[PDB]
Symmetry: D2
Subunit: 473 residues, 4 copies
């Protein structure tokens, strides 16, 4: 009955690319928990257990953004819907394929806008196997954006052995969708590119002056520091993805005289104060920038880069901007960088990190302090899972403010049977607070140490024994 | 202020290609702005009393020629009465813009209702250059959601303006321009495996499947000329099926699409894919085709198509009394390329299918989203009006092409108030409604309604005629709008269909 | 399996006072209908069948407000929830006990019954679950514990009940009580709206009562007299919505407003309200000079209306309302369409005592008035029928405009197998509807009535009274043609004469 | 505009009895400090919104007043989710104050609240500021009424959105005055039929039932002199059950209430009634009694009660190891009139029920709405603050607040100890952590991290240590054994 379906659902999820499931102990109990246990011991799926339902949601988000695969989270409680809320909101705005599994019972008496779909299974053979597997492929497709190009969370409810397809394939195969919507842009108009979360890669814009957020993959080689923007007057703005970070960016995007062209990978598009003139997925370009425009942009960029480096050296104290500058100087191709969505991602932008070669993650969907520790842990687990399937696991470095670390300190309560990352290092920046991070870390039995900003590079260079936290005052 | 907001919203909707607005009067500034645009000739106002039939009138105005259409509400039972039309517009993917006028402080003083059905539910700001951009941006975003400019999933949008001319772009341009989106998802299909195409509502055109035997619902656009009658399907052994669009009509289709042992390939124009098969093997938007169908497979399917058609026509002629199936056959024979055919969503659309209508050259419409009784008269009127609008716009001085609707008496009676049109409101010039009047578990337990009295009540020309007169009567143009009633028998219906079955 | 579930659920509904159920032919559902069919054959319930789902909702509205009972509508289709929407909204704002059998915000409860489990082992404890939930539905719908009746949504996807037919979970109707201190020597007017209670200790005060409000006393104050007076203080009963002078006064920030309601909800106009309760604990008595002023302005309002109607040659809708008012008798039920008829009856001065006045004042929509009148007449006749009393059923008289008639003309589509009222008479005041606001139109009402085989007659206003005194011809429609051109100047002539 | 809008709603809230506000951090924010600086409200600041919601719940249950949480973020409302569920089921008047922007959201829960009210976008209206005063204060008076149950008798959480000083009434009165509402629904009950009273969360007080044997959850206000231990109930067969409030605690209660043979009478303070019994025969708010209980019934219940009490007491003494039940019993024996007791909602509340606590003169709090582990630390802090604050207004030593919570619950909500140095801090809150291990978490280190006084003590020191106040907030950790708990419970049941 509900045992046979549970095993078909799990098998179909695995065939759809689910490698990780996060589970919470329940007031009742997890839809298909035994079938998940079975798949874990088999090596087919990796299970993760957490007491806190909220940090469980962010652990799954991390497991999704670390290598780009869909992830399941099995609710089990009367508190569960409400605790996963923040993670579902983040998964919606950041377009993260989070599958929320649950169970409600038909035999007993009885997320809305944020999810891409709400699918309920038939309660309860050969034909029924086909109805269970199609439903699960539909869950996966909506979650991964396979048809919509708009990934996001999905609520999948199971009301509480038979073969799938030959050769391990999804019951219902849905190939890669190409979403495409070309836009004429003339590049001899003085243009700046603003790159935000979820931006695509555009080789025909690679030469333009580009203000790129740390999570935005860069198409080229001509960066423009954000603090250089108020010193320039673009006639035209190309906006990739959804940029939120800086005030001169918002000011420029809300200037009625400056045409903004929005280029996205999915069907959503943003505005600031309704001044977007046109949408697309890519540009068909004519012209080339004025050399005088490029020179001026380049000069204002050196000028801004210089004024940050000077005022950092000018300051005796170690601010959070010094910490960001030292982390950036220490990263190397192949690293994953996970940034807290508040000050870390802003400080890394100002310190001028060159992100090419680096996999940068941040919960930019709602930019909440919430959940950064579990997100970093989940990203590291999934990223190291990807490397294992190809020498030593590549580093994951996380930058987190001290309030954010203590807020999500529950992410550190990991039982000894649960998967732990090999190469995660969390750098905490201690900028009215009073908490002792070192006591916090020993309470949860996590190697921790205070260090000066000068020594972060060398300390980061030496592989640590597992999960560690570096506190910087 | 609210007057500025309403004149901006209207101007932006016109740049989006809204040509027709349906207005339900109540209580306000939006109403005058539409009055200005209509008097200017920039749009076409339609005023209706009943909010429900107004939504179905908008459906018809939208599917008549493919444009986005607005329904403006100014009332409290307003959104609730547009429910049925919003559901229809959801499942049939119709760009319907529901403009509401919410009064927030008054609902508090007593002491997104549509929810999942709409593509978007966007509140405008309660009523200088900054607010112009906020208002026109919100409106271009309403328009794109409704037409599927970026999603390829058109449908209904809730647009709420609460209540207590700054220009748009040069050259009549939409504020935020959204160019053509192509959504692409090829599937590899081998045509040497014995294949039939099932084509439903919303199906795209596929020239590389033109040769295959195709069971096409009346509203599906055909890609070829190798039709396969739906009653022929159970007499054949296809090894795989290509599903276009969202088919719902026939039991042989549903029984075949539930055939666990037959692979189904689902091709659609947008992101949704139908549930009807649990053995769907692959979903996509177009086929990449290896090979070709065997000539012996084509000949067998062509032969069985001819056989099912002949059995239907033979049993019709041997059956002593006029049924709705006879009426549908007679309508089908009377149509000609350029005609628009509007079909009631219950028996008429099935009966036209059984009668074997050849739909190439004909624009066939039917509310196949939920296939309700409601609104068929208003849908046919709006479809006639928009389709005539496009032909007027072509320059040809010729009489507008015909719109012919086929609806049952119960549906006609139930939406008869769709005929209540003010003297100053747009009337179709070449709309003919054929009413197949066959009178019709505790509910099962029967009308006796006088259809000609009903038309007299709304001052619509109406004539009772026999099935053999229908063709010649339809050939003769009449009043702009008219109703032709054909009496029919429902008791012998079971007997006719059993005869058709046994004759195969 | 299911059969047992539907039979107990129907049985509990009948125990809970449900006498009428409305049903639509639909694509799905039979057992729910079978259990209802049995109960209809045996005379326990009366089933009504309708094809238009919107019509069915308003028919059930009428069956509920005619004699105060909960009523079920049983949905059966994919268009059903969406068509039942307008009636659920009306039921919500007018606090009508409408049970919807298979909305979110609009309903008092959304209950799902257990999918029936096929084990006769547990049929005695799982009887009790089914009846409890049914009693939970009835209590939410009738306001048994909340004092806030409204629509409920009840999902169903021979073991007995309590002895003596008692409902399973007995909830004695509640007393909700919240006394408010009010000094009646301050010059007070009472504004009585929809859903108002009866207050004996306020009976002497000048009272502007909407036609659906029960009169507490014998001191009426015409709404047109209100702008000619300065109340120092207002007592607002229920939820008044009718007149702009009332909205102006209720809005006035200088005038304290005391809201007295029968349920937990309370209204405001412009957040003006100083206090809320359910009853007045009064000190004092109205100053005689205040009662004199109010009575004198009441007379001038009444005189201005009747005189200017007589000096007006063309028959308006206000003439029709006046004639219907003059023909009413104690024991009649009056049903008013929600726009002009209820306003015009208030203007013409109806004394409502002895009269049961119904109107869909929750959202005041044009929709559903024909079926609401039909439903109200059926439930009212059926109550009087259960007194055993040998006199023939009392008249129901509905007054509606032309537009409302065509808008709900589908309500006249009644099979010969269905309950039809014995003494219902629908007066249509036909005003023929500028292009948007005026809504000009021509409908032949008599052609429409003939299409549905309903007796109809177009008559003059003067014949209305005599024609109304006639015996019951079953169900009839009486049309009186009316002119809206002269309406603007008749109203102005009343004000100037005021 | 926005600025004066914020100032007036803050002022109406204060008129309607709001004394504490919890702020997660614009004009609404600034309206609160001036009222906090003026001493009109006491403002509390928190960084974690889930934590802020549970602190507010504690502030509301500590003394029965309405409490606002003011929030300004997008993750804001979602993070307040679990506290809103608790406030719904426990009927806690929590006003969720929300401030955010529609255009900004465009340019990128509902069933739990008693009301969702969006206030008007501030319009300057220099000449309409009078009618804008009235529309904002009225709406704030609706929010307070819906929250406190002033007309419904059904208190709960309210969503009050303000999107993005003109005087109130004379003499500090609220804009719309709602007097006391009594909801009354008499029920005829004959007490000569053998009756047990089961009193749950939210139970009222009924003098005419005082002589009946009564199984009372720890949070149930007691009205009688005749308790019946919960372990005694399986050993009896009542002929009638009177169910007070919403009982959730014990499996023998569920089994008896689901027993098809036993008529159940439901008496509640509000219009809701529990569905625990499918055989609920009737529901009301008070009983009108005929008769009186038969002496033989009263004798049998008193004897069963004595056996249960003796079984617990004697098997605790004979047990060679400290368990959570020894800790619960030691906390019970150390309580005195005036104390406030806060219980974590899994084991502590059950263990205090079996230890057989006498709740007379004791105010007992527990998040019995959904009985989750979330926010127990913050609820206790909030209950202590509000309880202490109601003692200062009486004009009289701050009374003790003692909290008993398991170690996993303490770990989970330990970040509720993160309290800024300007923020209000309890005078006399002692958290007793009963640590049977559940993780490997050092609880003492956790208290270090938040700079909270902490000691590990043995169970027989707890009574002594509890009158040694020291810091305003302290944590007392009692190590306990979980390995022998099944045997202790079996020894108790076997001795019944």
């Amino acid at each position: 009955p509900s045992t046979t379906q549970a095993r078909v659902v799990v098998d179909e999820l695995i065939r759809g690319g689910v490698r990780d499931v996060v589970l919470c102990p329940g007031s009742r109990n997890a839809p298909l928990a035994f079938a998940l246990q079975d798949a874990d011991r088999s090596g087919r799926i990796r299970l993760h257990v957490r007491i806190d339902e909220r940090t469980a949601g962010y652990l799954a988000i991390g497991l999704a953004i670390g290598a780009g695969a869909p992830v399941c989270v099995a609710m089990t409680s009367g508190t569960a819907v409400a605790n996963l809320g923040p993670a579902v909101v983040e998964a919606n705005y950041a377009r993260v394929p989070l599958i929320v599994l649950s169970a409600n019972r038909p035999y007993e008496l009885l997320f809305g806008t944020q999810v891409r779909a709400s699918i309920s299974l038939g309660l309860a053979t050969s034909a029924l196997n086909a109805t269970w597997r199609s439903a699960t492929c539909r869950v996966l497709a909506a979650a991964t954006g396979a048809r919509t190009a708009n990934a996001g969370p999905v609520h999948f409810d199971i009301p509480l052995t038979p073969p799938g397809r030959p050769a391990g394939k999804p019951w219902t195969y849905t190939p890669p969708v190409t979403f495409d919507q070309p836009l004429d842009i003339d590049l001899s108009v003085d243009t700046v590119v603003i790159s935000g979360h979820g931006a695509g890669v555009h080789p025909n814009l690679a030469a333009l002056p580009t203000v790129a957020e740390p999570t935005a993959p860069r198409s080229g080689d001509n960066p423009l520091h954000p603090l250089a923007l108020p010193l320039l007057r673009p006639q035209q703005v190309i906006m990739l993805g959804r940029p939120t970070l800086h005030r001169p960016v918002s000011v420029l995007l809300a200037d009625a005289e400056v045409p903004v062209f929005a280029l996205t990978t999915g069907p959503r598009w943003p505005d600031v104060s309704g001044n977007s003139q046109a949408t697309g997925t890519r540009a068909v370009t004519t012209g080339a920038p004025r050399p005088a425009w490029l020179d001026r942009c380049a000069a204002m960029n050196r000028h801004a880069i210089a004024a940050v480096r000077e005022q950092l050296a000018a300051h005796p104290l170690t601010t959070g901007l010094h910490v960001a500058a030292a982390v950036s100087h220490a990263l190397r191709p192949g690293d994953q960088l996970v940034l807290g969505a508040s000050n870390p991602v802003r400080d890394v932008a100002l310190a001028g990190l060159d992100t090419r070669g680096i996999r940068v993650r941040s919960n930019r969907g709602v930019a909440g302090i919430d959940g950064t520790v579990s997100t970093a842990i989940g990203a590291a687990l999934a990223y190291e899972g990807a490397h294992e399937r190809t020498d030593s696991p590549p580093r994951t470095i996380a930058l987190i403010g001290d309030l954010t670390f203590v807020h999500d300190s529950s992410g550190l309560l990991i039982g000894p049977t649960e998967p732990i990352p090999r190469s995660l290092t969390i750098v905490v920046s201690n900028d009215p607070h009073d908490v002792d991070v070192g006591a916090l870390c020993r309470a949860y039995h996590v190697e921790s140490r205070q260090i000066e900003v000068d020594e972060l590079g060398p300390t980061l260079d030496q592989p640590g024994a597992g999960m560690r936290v570096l506190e910087v005052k």
